Amino acid sequence: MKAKEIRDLTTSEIEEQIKSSKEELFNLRFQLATGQLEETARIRTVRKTIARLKTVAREREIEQS
Amino acid sequence: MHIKKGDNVKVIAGKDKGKEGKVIATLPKKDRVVVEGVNIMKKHQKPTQLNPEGGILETEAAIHVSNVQLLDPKTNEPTRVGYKFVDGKKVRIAKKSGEEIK
Amino acid sequence: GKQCFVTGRKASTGNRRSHALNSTKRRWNANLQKVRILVDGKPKKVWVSARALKSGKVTRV
Amino acid sequence: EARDILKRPVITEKSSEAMAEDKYTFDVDTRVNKTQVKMAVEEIFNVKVASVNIMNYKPKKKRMGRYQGYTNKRRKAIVTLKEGSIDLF
RNA sequence: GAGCUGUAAGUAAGCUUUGAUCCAGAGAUUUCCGAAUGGGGAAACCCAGCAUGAGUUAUGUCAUGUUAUCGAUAUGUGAAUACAUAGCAUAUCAGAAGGCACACCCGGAGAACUGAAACAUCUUAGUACCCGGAGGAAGAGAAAGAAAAUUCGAUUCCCUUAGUAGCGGCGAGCGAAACGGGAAGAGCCCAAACCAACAAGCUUGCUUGUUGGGGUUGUAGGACACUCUAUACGGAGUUACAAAGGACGACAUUAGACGAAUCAUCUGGAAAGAUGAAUCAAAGAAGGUAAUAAUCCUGUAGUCGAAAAUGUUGUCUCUCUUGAGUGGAUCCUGAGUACGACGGAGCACGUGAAAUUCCGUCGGAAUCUGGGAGGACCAUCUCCUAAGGCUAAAUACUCUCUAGUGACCGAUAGUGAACCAGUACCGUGAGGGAAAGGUGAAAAGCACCCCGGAAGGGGAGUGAAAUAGAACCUGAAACCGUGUGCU
RNA sequence: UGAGUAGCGAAAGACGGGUGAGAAUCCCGUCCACCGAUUGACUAAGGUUUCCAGAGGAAGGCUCGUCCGCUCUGGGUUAGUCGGGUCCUAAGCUGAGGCCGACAGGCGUAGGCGAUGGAUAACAGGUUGAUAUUCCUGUACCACCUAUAAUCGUUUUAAUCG
């Protein structure tokens, strides 16, 4: 998910998306550990999604001040 | 590079000097290109690898980009390339005919 | 770190000289005396030189 | 933070014997304590934890070519379940 | 503007013209240690208080913030001791701390080997080292100057004076300055007299203190008295001379864009070489490309370009701000100062006939009819006006960035380090401190067969070359082998 | 070069059967021998993965090597009660204010830090290739928390804390 859609989302939606993305990342890591993950690029994709979500959240809580 | 994937070029230096072919890959960081039918190498392929069958495989090796020259679309002569700006877009121009390469 | 509270008078360095002009380092110390004066409107015992005390220019209280 | 507390499961012969004993082995963040590990496992897998043992493993010297180095130090927790089960696969 | 997920090959999974990768400006994140600052500690660890929150029935657990010391400024309380003074407590502060560029600057403290053919005065040397303080420069600086003529007019720095004058167990050695020629230039503010307001002593005389005005000097100046001139007209300014801002513009820096002109044959693996015939040039700098290229590529001359940030600047704004003259009645013009003695030090000058300047100790002026200097000292003459402060430039240096240069090195050289080097290694530690570059144009890096467990080799093949096959360009000598003509 | 020379670092091995390209040297067996106030079992320092399993035989191993403390691959260390911290202090170190000192800094009070000492609750058995007072079985103990409580208290108190 890109920064444009992230900015479309609302703050509560940003937090929920961060939670679900972190849960997905955890599941991906566990599959990788157990040897059940072939599509390894998903880990990096989700990591960058989380980074973008947090970036937009920080932008909002900065511009509020 | 002034030569681009898919371009039709003439080899102006090398064993294949005088041959014409299509550019099927470019290596910007090495200033090299791969041209169909140009610079064929015979590599020893082990059948024991992931490919069962083995032997001597013939394939094009990359050539230095300054050894190929674009062909003028009108005259079909090798030509250098300039650039024009048409409605704010860069256009490759053959310096011999003035046409647009692509 | 000893000097006159009033003027900053402090020790200096120089030479002791023999009759044959041999030289060794020595100090000239100030003639400091521990006196009670008014510091910031309150009594306080500080180091003051005899010369800074001379002619009653410092009030001892 | 539970998903940060737990890093990955450990799959070895000793760890498989433990799993037969209802003990699940994880690599965990090197800074967390036994209680945090217990709470993270209970939150993520919805189980009841009987106990947690924990241990540290030093960085291990490792060589590749002419370059000498070390593996990351590890913190390994062994969680004995009271109720429920964990399916790693 | 087409590829990309570093060195770094491989595989995998992916991204990208709906513009990746990549380049520049700005922003976000930025674990732990470290001045390290809640406390402790054997750095990168451990253990807490307080507030708020998460979680639990609750405890245990967790998250965020905060909590060092000193300094300064406020507030409360306040011992011996009455008043209040220590003290204590709370609050605020982009206050300090620590680092380094092994450079340059100022200062504190300060050797020795060495030279003197010994050595002590002297020298090395106010050097090395240590310590404090900086700044982008520092230091100095608007005459108590230099001088001795038609005098000059702050300071600094360069040339010269000059290895002169001098100093010196008159040994070794040390060694000016003025003048003259240059770089660069810039001049200012206080203290005091006096005036007004305020407060204490309450003569409630007018003394002291704070604030503001005034004033700033040698041609003596100022106060004071008087006469003109103006409330920003003018003038000045954040580089001193007072101190903060704002608007617009210009230029520059940090990515980039365009950018002329060559074909053929021979040799050769390959042409840029040779040969023949052309072309461009404000471009014949340079690097690369299969050998040596102005015209193949990247470039070069030239021209163009900035969303954003930064820097330097111009004009407006803003801010501040009177400027001259006459008079000599009175007043002011830097005090434990100048200066002297004793003891040191600094001055090129070693105490000397020793001025000129600083320190310790002790003594201790004058007040414009004053005071200082012209190398003891006195007189005369002349030049200055100390005991308060500020001040750009010309000067020094280079950790660093950008663009370049060299009758500088070319792998035992050049950095210690061309390479994963302050590494390996050595040492308790401070510290010492290496060796080590080159396949090929391209990896085309030797399919396959044979002997061998492998290593290694012989073919085959790639390649111009493998007698270029992996520390793989060339491959000297020492040294070690095999064969052999003569002996 | 010396030179195929000196040396190969205290000692008792023999044979059979395996393995393997290769065996005096590896594995297994029998017999023999050696230490046994110990060459045995723990354990503090110190070291820091050398530990276990599978694989290897270039180099290291003073020979050899099929083997190894070596090389490769993957593993292994579990605590309320054991030792240390969330307890105590000795020497010593440090040290707000403070005293002293050209600078740097030295000394030092309150206060801290600091075991080699004081205090302090778990034992037996079983188990792996590699850990075990740590895992498992059985049976305990210590501190704290929540609920229900025989009983006692209920503002000079009188139960309770201190």
Add this chain to the structure above:
RNA sequence: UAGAUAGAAAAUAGGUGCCCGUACCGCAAACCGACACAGGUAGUCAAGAUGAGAAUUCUAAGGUGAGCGAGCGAACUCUCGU
């Protein structure tokens, strides 16, 4: 005791209890000695016969055969017996 406050708890039931170390060598081939080095390295346990004994000799529990060998059986050197 000074002080603090309505509330306290014998018992019963249930629950909570962190961080560091823990491998292995450790009179040694893993430590200090440049070495798989006849040296050095605190403490605990330590059986039988004999004996005063932790001496002595031989054994136990347990561990070990020592990381060059095979011959020969000169001088000489060393260690040992007469």
